[PDB]
């Protein structure tokens, strides 16, 4: 704009917020909620789209939302607290260390892990998750454990499975973009899924890229399951989901149910409603299941109408 | 116990780390200083189970969590953030407070320029306490520590456009075209004399209150330090005086030659103070964290921000 640019600029003039360093103690969280601000894009910048995401503390974000009354100028600097808050300087590994890394530790005690990015198109999700990917760094860290002389008992066969769910119509990105079937006995279990066993972290990357190559990408979720198996017996399964754009009517009720199913994980779940909640129902039960949410946003003023909902979604997932 | 709000404030502050202001911090030196100071919840305030409602996550940042209601009557919070040069809380002494607001200014008056400090806010916030020992006295010895010149002391109150000097027992004065004659300026040789001037002035039996430090060499003014304790921002003629202040201060970041007066008695006598290539000012907006005095608290802040202007 102009005006709303100086009120902000004036605000960030006395700001002394501190930046979260890698050294910062990794916390161990049962249900972690973080927010990732995305750096400003040269196109968003070229139009002089104004930076409006103040992240003064490792544990804190701000939004100087622009509204007006006489039309005499004001700014409503709104605060939202979180477990973590990433800025435009936070690298991928930086976001990894505090979301998915501790969760790798959880699958090696048969525990269930599930980790989401949840934001609009052009917020960071499907980037910020997947060599760049939280996917990729998950494996790299996973293989390292298998090597360690501490888990080498339980002679495990690393596997892989990348599928995509679109309007109840799921699809396995492991075949010629084939479709699948889902049922549950009088528990949940898929049908046709082809567990791809990998034994190199490089394997996973060239295994993922299929779904990458296959798959607007924004009307569907991408769900990636890491499963540990010892002797064909299932250990623990890790689900990494690049959710469908949070901004077509079934989608909102897929997130109605998801949000509802992260609520009862804290209270120790209305799964039967949506297809996303059905496949990952396991990771929402017992004292062995940890989840991590990455509600990612956009730094621009135009987004503020819609990135204040993503922030409102997230604030209702910590209770 | 309204209870539900105090629940929502604590599930906020739980996830929140804070890096306060410490003595390790540098002493900043600006044109116009806008600070804020939250007082602690007193007993009588605690005994009613009043939720603290204001946080200070850092030296400058200030967060207020205000209780809002839907048409549902769904209890809500709206977390408003504010920035200032130095925001400080309960833990902050006056020694902390003087060092970051008035302390840089003592050096200013010995230069040849002229400095003024206001504590502004709601009744029972912490204005009188902040300035009244208080900032008046704290400047004094540090004013007196800096060493041929003599020092003079003024103390007076402004009500209903009238002007009293407390130094003489209720001694009414007049203001004219700027010069207030009957200006009681007692000469002091050290904090000893000055300390006696404050409490005597304060002892007198909804009002502005001004204390002045003055310097003369040939018998000619050198530096003027004016420390004002304003009235409560909540007969309603007080609303105007404080409103003028904002305009008076604002013309000091525009390095402006012209300022407005007349419509404010307070200003008139403090009026040399808002001009020159060497006039600095600090503003202390003190607030009451008692949740059921939040509207007054917000009003106390929306006045003070962007008056960095």
């Amino acid at each position: 704009n102009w005006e709303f640019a100086r009120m902000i600029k004036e605000f960030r003039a006395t700001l002394e917020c501190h930046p979260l360093t890698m050294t910062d103690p990794i916390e161990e969280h049962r249900i972690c909620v973080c927010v990732r601000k995305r750096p400003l894009n040269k196109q968003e910048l070229a139009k002089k789209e104004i930076d409006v995401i103040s992240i003064p503390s490792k544990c804190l974000l701000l939004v100087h939302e622009p509204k007006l009354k006489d039309l005499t100028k004001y700014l409503e600097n709104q605060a939202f607290c979180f477990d973590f808050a990433f800025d435009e300087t936070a690298s991928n590994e930086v976001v990894y260390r505090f979301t998915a890394r501790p969760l790798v530790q959880t699958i090696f005690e048969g525990g269930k892990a599930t980790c989401f990015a949840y934001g609009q198109t052009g917020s960071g999700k499907t980037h910020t998750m997947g060599s760049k990917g939280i996917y990729a760094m998950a494996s790299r860290d996973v293989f390292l454990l298998k090597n360690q002389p501490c888990y080498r008992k339980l002679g495990l066969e690393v596997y892989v499975t990348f599928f995509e769910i679109y309007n109840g119509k799921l699809f396995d990105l492991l075949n010629k973009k084939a479709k699948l079937r889902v049922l549950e006995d009088g528990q949940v279990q898929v049908v046709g899924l082809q567990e791809h066993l990998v034994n190199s972290a490089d394997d996973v990357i060239k295994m993922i890229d299929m779904g990458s190559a296959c798959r607007n990408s924004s009307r569907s979720h991408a769900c990636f399951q890491i499963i540990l198996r010892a002797k064909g017996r299932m250990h623990g399964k890790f689900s990494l989901v690049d959710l469908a754009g949070n901004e077509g009517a079934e989608i909102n009720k897929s997130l109605l149910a998801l949000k509802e199913c992260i609520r009862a994980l804290g209270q120790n779940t209305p799964f039967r409603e949506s297809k996303l909640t059905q496949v990952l129902r396991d990771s929402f039960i017992g004292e062995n299941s940890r989840t991590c949410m990455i509600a990612t946003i956009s730094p621009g003023i135009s987004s503020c109408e819609y990135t204040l909902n993503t922030l409102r979604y997230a604030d209702r997932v910590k209770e | 116990p309204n209870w539900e709000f105090a629940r929502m404030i604590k599930e906020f502050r739980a996830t929140l780390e804070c890096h306060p202001l410490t003595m390790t911090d540098p002493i900043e030196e600006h044109r116009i200083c806008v600070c804020v100071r939250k007082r602690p919840l007193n007993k009588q305030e605690l005994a009613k189970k009043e939720i603290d409602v204001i946080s200070i996550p850092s030296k400058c940042l200030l967060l207020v969590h205000e209780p809002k209601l839907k048409v549902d009557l769904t209890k809500y919070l709206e977390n408003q953030a504010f920035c200032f040069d130095f925001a400080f809380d309960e833990t902050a002494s006056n020694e902390v407070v003087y060092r970051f607001t008035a302390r840089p200014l003592v050096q200013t008056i010995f230069e040849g320029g002229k400095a003024t400090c206001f504590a502004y806010g709601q009744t029972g916030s912490g204005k009188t306490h902040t300035m009244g020992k208080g900032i008046y006295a704290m400047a004094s010895r540090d004013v007196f520590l800096l060493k041929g010149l003599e020092v003079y002391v003024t103390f007076f109150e402004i009500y209903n456009g009238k002007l009293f000097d407390l130094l003489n027992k209720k001694a009414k004065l007049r203001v004219l075209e700027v010069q207030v004659v009957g200006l009681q300026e007692h000469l002091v040789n050290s904090a000893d004399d000055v300390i006696k001037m404050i409490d005597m002035g304060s002892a007198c039996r909804r009002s502005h209150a001004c204390f002045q430090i003055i310097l003369r060499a040939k018998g000619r003014m050198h530096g003027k330090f004016s420390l004002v304790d304003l009235a409560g921002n909540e007969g309603a003629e007080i609303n105007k005086s404080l409103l003028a202040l904002k305009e008076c201060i604002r013309a000091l970041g525009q390095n402006k030659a012209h300022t407005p007066f007349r419509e404010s008695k307070l200003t008139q006598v403090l009026r040399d103070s808002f001009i020159g290539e060497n006039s600095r000012t600090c503003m202390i907006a003190t607030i009451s964290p008692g949740i059921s005095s939040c509207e007054y608290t917000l009003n106390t802040l929306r006045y003070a921000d962007r008056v960095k202007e």
Partner: peptide
């Protein structure tokens, strides 16, 4: 743990 007022 969390979280602590310090710096």
């Amino acid at each position: 743990l969390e979280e602590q007022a310090s710096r």
